[PDB]
Write a protein that binds this ligand. Structure first.
Ligand SMILES: [Zn+2]
Ligand SMILES: [Zn+2]
Ligand SMILES: [Zn+2]
Ligand SMILES: [Zn+2]
Ligand SMILES: [Zn+2]
Ligand SMILES: [Zn+2]
Ligand SMILES: [Zn+2]
Lengths: 398, 397
């Protein structure tokens, strides 16, 4: 019982120095490797032009970390030559400061049509088969259609085909984000006390993430007590902690854009027999999902392995409650959620380097939920946890 | 006096939660918004409207969630309660935030939610879908998978609703702006030699929270000295020096409605160039405002700011020193929305429309001066949400 409650705030703060032995940032050669990979997958799908919008995919291919806006900022990759970077002219200086890939800047002034620029660049290289970023706003399709009459493919297969398998450098940045958030999770359980507010934990978790050297504090944070733990993504309203209540904390940060995403569920005080049984079951379901992971295995097979555990114990089947109402997991990288998804119907075979979450949450309607979440990556022979799973309902940390 | 002189503790004495808070949007108003979209659909020959999670779903239904890879959407047709497409597992969380009566169509994880959209269309003999232009392109792919018919862009329908704000919408934006204006005042107040950009950003977030914003600072740009020449700034912490301009662009939300205010002021003594360019910026912003009245095109407001700059020998067009980007953007449940105060936009301003007025001057290699205050259009002219600055060393009226 040494992990829950024993700690005061500035006592926690003494363990919040900036992270050391930081992982190296992605280098210029790796960006080029990603471009070349995209080109292979473009050729495979019969595509000769690829438009990537501002967001995690632009960051992946070029280093530009900006969120998307109403203004088109995009990378147009074609079969050869430096890719074109379409960008508002007033942003050129900011752009140069973040670009990690050599490009050919095509700048547009505010009243000019940036979609016209994209097609002009396509015509220059005689590209006539575009694949468009599935994350880009629909407005961009509308813009391109005024100028482009040929088929516009969904670039999802190409983008996933690149991003799903992580390089050692990517794994190391993810590892760093995970090690940090694990510590934040540990300290959050430490300072928990009777009456503490959910808002207080959220705020501490953000503070901790910042102190440890995350990109931007907490990426997200879900904290729920007692019966509120039955809602997987939570509900509005501040709670205050009472003995006997489960505490669910799902949170993460980013390091150079790469996400951690960890959930811990633990008891504050004495657990009921119901809470203990469901907690142990959650641990076993997560364990089973992990044990099913090796190269070649269909993603849905991992989801099924977790459900098989629940069913054997009289929960489920399928998504029936009490049981697991959502997928077992999601891929994770530069985005909090990305391919491959650990979900029924997904026949995608797992390959070394693939990163996904393992979080087969059990919901007991009207009562509580137990969610344990740690991420893994696929190895040559099996899997490797980014963070080791919890041990007991009152021992969230291995 | 407005710049410096205030300690952090004295600043915090002014940070009680906001009082005289504006009312949240009522059930009746969400229904009015739906009815407006319906006539806009009819005006356009559209009989189905799909709205994705985001500021537009919040606008029509009250649901505030960010978009995800899982479709969460509102399908509006010509009659009946609109359909809400949503993951089955989210139904509980959904019920806690929905402000509109809907017909739920829930999908399990392995099921095709786009199939549910098209089934709902088929049941109502709808064949003319307009799609939310803010939605992920993956949704277009998913719907096209099931539709051989045209999929139109829903921009005109959505803007046709959102551009003109109701009195309740104005009051929520007004509160957010009043809050952020005070945060701007306190930020200028605690300024001192050596203070970091990172420290100002943290205080401004802390302040927005204490005041009762939705989620601290929505965003925050703080630049010093030469760094003020970059409209959206650049990486790196700075520490304040005498003789440097400070630019602060920040905002919060209240019930989702945005503030968005920029102040640029001198710490210490300004140079002649800084003073002249500061004055010119106030004048450009003033002229843009004076141009606003019903019927005036958005581009004419942008042109009024540019004409001031060109008269003074800056520009023309976007040439620097001058104004490298548009004069402003609409603002509401989104930080950026229609109508845009930009060349080429012939959209006439009408009463209720809300927009920023921020004709920033950039002086390459030297500095930039940005003043930003938002306004709404009235029957005869315009009304500031916040009053413009007075001088380079008096950021607040
Ligand atoms: Zn959710
Ligand atoms: Zn999570
Ligand atoms: Zn997760
Ligand atoms: Zn997601
Ligand atoms: Zn920017
Ligand atoms: Zn602004
Ligand atoms: Zn603005």
């Amino acid at each position: 019982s040494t992990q829950i409650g024993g700690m005061s705030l500035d006592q926690a703060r003494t363990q919040l120095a900036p992270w050391t032995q930081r992982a190296a940032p992605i280098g210029a050669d790796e960006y080029q490797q990603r471009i070349e990979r995209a080109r292979v997958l473009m050729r495979a799908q019969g595509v000769d032009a690829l438009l990537i919008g501002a967001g995690t995919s632009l960051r992946y291919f070029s280093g530009v970390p900006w969120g998307a806006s109403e203004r088109l900022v995009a990378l147009l990759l074609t079969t050869e030559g430096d890719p074109v970077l379409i960008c508002p002219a007033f942003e050129e200086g900011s752009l140069d400061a973040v670009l990690q890939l050599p490009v050919r800047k095509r700048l547009w002034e505010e009243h000019e049509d940036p979609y016209a620029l994209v097609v002009q660049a396509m015509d220059e290289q005689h590209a006539h088969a575009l694949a468009l970023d599935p994350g880009i706003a629909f407005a961009v399709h509308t813009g391109l259609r005024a100028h482009l009459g040929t088929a516009i493919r969904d670039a999802g297969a190409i983008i996933d085909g690149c991003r799903m398998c992580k390089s050692p450098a990517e794994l190391a940045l993810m590892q760093q984000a995970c090690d940090m958030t694990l510590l934040v999770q540990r300290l959050a359980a430490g300072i928990a006390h009777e009456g503490i507010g959910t808002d207080q934990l959220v705020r501490f978790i953000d503070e901790a993430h910042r102190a440890l050297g995350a990109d931007n504090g907490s990426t997200f944070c879900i904290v729920q007590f007692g019966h509120a733990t039955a809602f997987p993504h939570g509900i509005p309203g501040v709670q205050h902690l009472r003995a006997g209540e489960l505490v669910l904390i799902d949170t993460g940060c980013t390091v150079q854009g790469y996400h951690s995403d960890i959930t811990r569920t633990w008891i504050y005080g004495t657990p009921s027999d119901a809470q203990q049984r469901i907690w142990e079951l959650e641990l076993a379901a997560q364990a089973a999902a992990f044990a099913a992971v090796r190269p070649g295995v269909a993603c849905e097979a991992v989801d099924q392995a977790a459900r098989a555990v629940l069913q054997a114990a009289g929960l489920g089947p399928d998504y029936r409650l009490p049981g697991l109402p959502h997928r077992t997991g999601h891929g994770c990288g530069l985005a909090i959620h990305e391919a491959p998804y650990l979900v029924r119907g997904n026949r995608q075979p797992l390959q070394p380097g693939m990163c996904a979450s393992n979080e087969p949450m059990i919901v007991v309607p009207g009562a509580f939920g137990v969610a344990l979440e740690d991420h893994f990556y696929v190895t040559d022979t099996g899997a490797q946890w980014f963070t080791p799973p919890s041990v007991a309902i009152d021992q969230p940390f291995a």
